[PDB]
Each structure stands twice: as C-alpha cells, then as structure tokens.
C-alpha cells in the first residue's frame, strides 16, 4: 500500500463540542476535505512514538456515511503510523461498546462515528466523537487541541488504495511503503465483549428465568432503528431467551427509518400506543447510540427518569456487580429531580449534584468516588464503563422485576410510599428571542438575591412554598479543577420543592428556555394523583415569577417531559 501526502487547505468552524463534532452530512460530503482534516486533526494529538504500539477502536450507529467515513479513518491512521485498528462488524458498535472495549484491550483511546438521537440519512446529521484511553469522551484540553490543529492545517497522509471489508470477522494485515511493521485491521463481532462484560455484571441465569420461565415477562424492547438493535437480538433474545418479537425496530437502517431515534413520549410514540394496550409488562426504548433510555411499565406506565436511578439505587444490592464491588457514590445533574437525594440520605453513602453532561460523572468515576448516576433526560449509568448505557438500565431494571416479583407499577407505589414522591416535569421552550430571555434571568437573579427573598411565603391552592435558597447554580469539579459557574438559575422552597431555569441560548438563530419543576410530597393519599394537576401551584408561581409569559409571550411549553 503506498503512503501519500495531501496539501489541504484548513477549516475555521471544526470545533468540537463535548460530544464531539457535528455537522449535517451535506457538509462533509460537499466541503472538500472537511472529513479528512478533522480525522488527520485527532490522529495529530497522538504524539508519533506512541503510534506504532497504538491501537484505537472505531466504530458507530450506522446512520448514512458511516462506512465512507471508516473507509477514510483507515488510510489515514494506517498512513500515519498507527499500528492497529479494532472496528466492529459491519462498522457496528454502539457507544457503551466502544468504552467498554477501549479499557478491556487497553486502547489509546477511540473514534465514535454517531450524532446520537439527531436524525440520520442523507438531508440528516453526522458527527465524529473522540474518546480517551479511560473509555470516556475526550476532555476539553484535547478538544481545544484538535481545535487549533484543525484551523492552522496544510496537509494530511493518507494510503488511498487501502481498503478494508468491514463485514468479515478477523486479522487483516497490510504493508505499507518502506515502513517495518504491518498495519493491522481487526474486524471484531459486535456484540461480544459488551456482552462478555454484561455477563459478570449481571446473573444471566436468574434473567433466562424472567423471560423464558413460565411466568414470563413479556416485553417490548424498542431500539428505534438505532445501534443497539444487533444487542437486543444476541442477548435478549438469543441467550436470555426473550421470544423473537420482543425485539421491534431492531434492524440498524441509514435514516434510522426517517424519523429521530429519540427516547421519548413524543418520539418513541408507537412503542407508548403498544404499551397501552396492557398486553406487555415492561417496554423500552433506546437512542441513536444506545447510552439514554425510556422505561415503560404495564398499559403505558411512563416510569419518569429521575425516578428511574432512584429505583435502581434502593435497590442496587440485587445487581451482583453491586454486591461484589460496593456503591461508592451516587450522582445526579442538578436540574435532574429530588428522588435520588432521598434514597441517598438513607445510607452514609455520598451524592453529587452536578452540572449537566457526562465529564461530571466520569470525573467523579475515575476519582472511585461514583457507582450509579442519573439525568432526567432518559440518561442513567454506572462505573463499568466510562458513558450513559441504555441497555444496562435495562438489564439492571429486568434485574430488579425479577427479585423483586412485582409490576413496574408496583415497585414505583411501594418506592413512592417508602421515600415520598417527588413529582417531576419538564418544559421546553426552544429557541426564542434572547434579550427578553437575559432579562427574565436578570431581573429574576436581582429579585431571588435580595434580603427579604429569603424565608418568605409564596402560595397557591395545596401548598405554602417558603423560600429556603435562590440562586445561579455553579461548580467546582472536585477531579480536574474546572469552575461551571451560572449553570441555572435555582428556587429552591423549604418543603423540598424546586423550580429551575437553564437558558441554551445560539449566538446562530436564538435562544432555548427549559423549565424543570421538582414537587416534594410526602403524603399517603396525594403520593399517586397526576403530576400536571400537583405540579399546577409550581408551574404557575414560575411564570408568574420569571414573568416568562410577559417579557416572551408564549403562553404553553414547546415539549412537555
Ligand atoms: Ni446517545
């Protein structure tokens, strides 16, 4: 194979974000060279005497332009001295997979094609995630890095007669121009090592149980056309003995069969109509690249996902993995509800609140000071890897039904009856018009940092809502140094309620408001009514506060969660 150098002319909007970069397929098919220059950019950060003993893994959720984009990591990093390259079959791999195979083989770290729930095809998105050596996505010292790289490049090497099948299993080995060592491509089975590690997580035999046995639970596990199709298949169905039609859209397609992969009441709709014809006693959806997930209980039970890591935590000991390693800490992102904190305080065992993404979490995992974390957007997981697993949320909660012998329905009642409920909901207002939102946040800052904020009585209806704190909530990681400071603007009531404002504003169209209102209730009686109804006091006192209604005129929220 030869080793030619390309001269490129560089790129000024290739900054990565913390999921790496995305940008709709149009620009990497159309933009000369946009692909190329970024992959030389990633490889770049790998300093030469490492390269050689060097092996990363690549892979991704299969939307349109994956293989073009793993045909062209692999005359690149072949051509600029990486000795090894483990792709899965097919170029199939899902996000959970990828960590957990850059730690089982040491790995230097890993290229992740995926742009997660956002759509997939032709007129869709696209985007190229790089992960570290831990497992975890790459932090913000290297994201900068690849950044300057990328703006100031001339040229990148490539072998462009190299080409692999990517849908033949094992050791490919090719030479390249005047250079010693072969490169070596190694086409690994998808499923297998995550598979391997769930395996010992779990106890396999007492879930072949649950879905075989007589008793059978009957379920409808949902992967939106996404990546972790090929998993459902070969573990929940080929070993743990789920019947074939358990698996729905488990075929990974292109557009992801048009519509968005996204975990949700609104998009995983058909599986939510499915679910409430009371014919299955548990459902589930997944995204993308399989690391955020939907539980669903008998007749559509929506099982909220701040009540979700709740559950798995008072109830962590009857996951193996949990009692052969210890918990040693629980974690949730700040706007995430209440419900954890409660199971948290029952046991001398930590919580963080932390701001919103996953470095929070995986700082905290590598420090050994975190076992299972939660988000309210569909976002649970554990130290076995280094990012969100949606098909471990799974497992753990089939885990859970499966000692436990009771319904969804149930263990949520018993949950809520033992540690209090605290009703959850989110509101979207995507993009609006950013003066009158910065001023809703200021005049607001100004009003909750005042003297008499403090202690007093706001009320309507069932509750007296007393103002125990108020503020613009920041951070300072414990691991890496980092201050997040004005990550949401926090009320927070003496009763254990909350409401906050996070403002994901674009300085490219506008400007996204997101309204989360935490309830605390205690009482036996108003436990199970309807979160809208018992969150109407709340809701009201916060647009009757930020005067949202007043300085944005909108009325309702764009999606309710
Ligand atoms: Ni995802």
């Given at each position: 194979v030869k080793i030619v150098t390309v001269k490129t002319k560089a790129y000024p909007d290739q900054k990565p974000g913390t999921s790496g970069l995305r940008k709709r397929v149009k620009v990497f098919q159309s933009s000369t060279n946009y692909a190329e220059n970024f992959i030389q950019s990633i490889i770049s950060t790998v300093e030469p005497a490492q390269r050689q003993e060097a092996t990363l893994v690549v892979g991704g959720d299969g939307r349109f332009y994956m293989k073009e984009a793993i045909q062209l990591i692999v005359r690149i990093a072949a051509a600029n001295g990486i000795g090894r390259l483990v792709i899965g079959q097919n170029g199939i791999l899902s996000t959970p997979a990828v960590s957990c195979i850059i730690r089982k083989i040491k790995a230097i770290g890993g290229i992740i094609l995926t742009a997660s729930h956002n759509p997939g095809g032709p007129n869709g998105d696209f985007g190229i995630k790089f992960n570290i050596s831990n497992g975890g996505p790459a932090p913000e010292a290297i994201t900068d890095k690849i950044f300057q790289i990328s703006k100031t490049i001339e040229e990148y090497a490539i072998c462009p007669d190299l080409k692999v099948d990517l849908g033949v299993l094992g050791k490919q080995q090719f030479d390249l121009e005047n250079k010693f060592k072969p490169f070596t491509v190694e086409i690994v089975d998808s499923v297998e090592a995550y598979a391997t590690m769930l395996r010992n997580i779990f106890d396999f035999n007492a879930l072949k149980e649950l879905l075989s046995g007589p008793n059978r639970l009957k379920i409808r596990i949902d992967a939106m056309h996404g990546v972790v199709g090929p998993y459902v298949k070969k573990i929940l169905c080929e070993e743990l003995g789920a019947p074939a039609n358990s698996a729905v859209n488990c075929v990974p397609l292109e557009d992801f069969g048009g519509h968005h992969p996204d975990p949700n009441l609104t998009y995983a709709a058909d599986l939510v109509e499915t679910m409430k014809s009371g014919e299955h006693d548990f459902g589930a959806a997944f995204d993308g690249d399989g690391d955020r997930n939907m539980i669903l209980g008998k007749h559509g039970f929506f099982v909220n996902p701040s009540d979700s890591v709740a559950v798995i935590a008072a109830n962590i000991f009857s996951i193996p993995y949990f009692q052969q390693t210890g918990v040693r800490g629980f974690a949730r992102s700040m706007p995430t509800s209440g419900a954890l904190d409660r199971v948290a305080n029952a046991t001398k065992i930590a919580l963080y609140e932390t701001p919103t993404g996953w470095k929070f979490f995986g700082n905290l995992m590598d420090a050994s000071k975190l076992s299972l974390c939660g988000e309210e957007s569909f976002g649970t997981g554990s130290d076995h890897?280094?990012?969100?697993?949606?098909?471990?949320?799974?497992?753990?909660?089939?885990?859970?039904?499966?000692?436990?012998?009771?319904?969804?329905?149930?263990?949520?009642?018993?949950?809520?009856?033992?540690?209090?409920?605290?009703?959850?909901?989110?509101?979207?207002?995507?993009?609006?018009?950013?003066?009158?939102?910065?001023?809703?946040?200021?005049?607001?800052?100004?009003?909750?940092?005042?003297?008499?904020?403090?202690?007093?009585?706001?009320?309507?209806?069932?509750?007296?809502?007393?103002?125990?704190?108020?503020?613009?909530?920041?951070?300072?990681?414990?691991?890496?140094?980092?201050?997040?400071?004005?990550?949401?603007?926090?009320?927070?009531?003496?009763?254990?309620?909350?409401?906050?404002?996070?403002?994901?504003?674009?300085?490219?169209?506008?400007?996204?408001?997101?309204?989360?209102?935490?309830?605390?209730?205690?009482?036996?009686?108003?436990?199970?009514?309807?979160?809208?109804?018992?969150?109407?006091?709340?809701?009201?006192?916060?647009?009757?506060?930020?005067?949202?209604?007043?300085?944005?005129?909108?009325?309702?929220?764009?999606?309710?969660?």
């Open positions: 890897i280094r990012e969100k697993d949606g098909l471990w949320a799974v497992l753990a909660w089939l885990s859970i039904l499966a000692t436990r012998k009771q319904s969804v329905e149930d263990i949520l009642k018993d949950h809520w009856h033992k540690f209090g409920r605290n009703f959850f909901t989110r509101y979207d207002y995507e993009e609006v018009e950013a003066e009158g939102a910065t001023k809703m946040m200021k005049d607001l800052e100004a009003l909750m940092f005042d003297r008499s904020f403090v202690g007093k009585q706001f009320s309507a209806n069932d509750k007296v809502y007393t103002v125990e704190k108020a503020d613009n909530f920041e951070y300072h990681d414990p691991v890496d140094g980092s201050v997040s400071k004005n990550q949401g603007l926090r009320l927070i009531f003496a009763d254990g309620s909350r409401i906050i404002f996070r403002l994901s504003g674009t300085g490219s169209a506008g400007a996204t408001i997101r309204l989360y209102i935490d309830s605390y209730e205690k009482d036996n009686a108003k436990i199970n009514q309807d979160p809208q109804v018992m969150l109407a006091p709340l809701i009201s006192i916060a647009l009757k506060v930020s005067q949202l209604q007043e300085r944005t005129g909108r009325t309702a929220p764009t999606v309710i969660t």
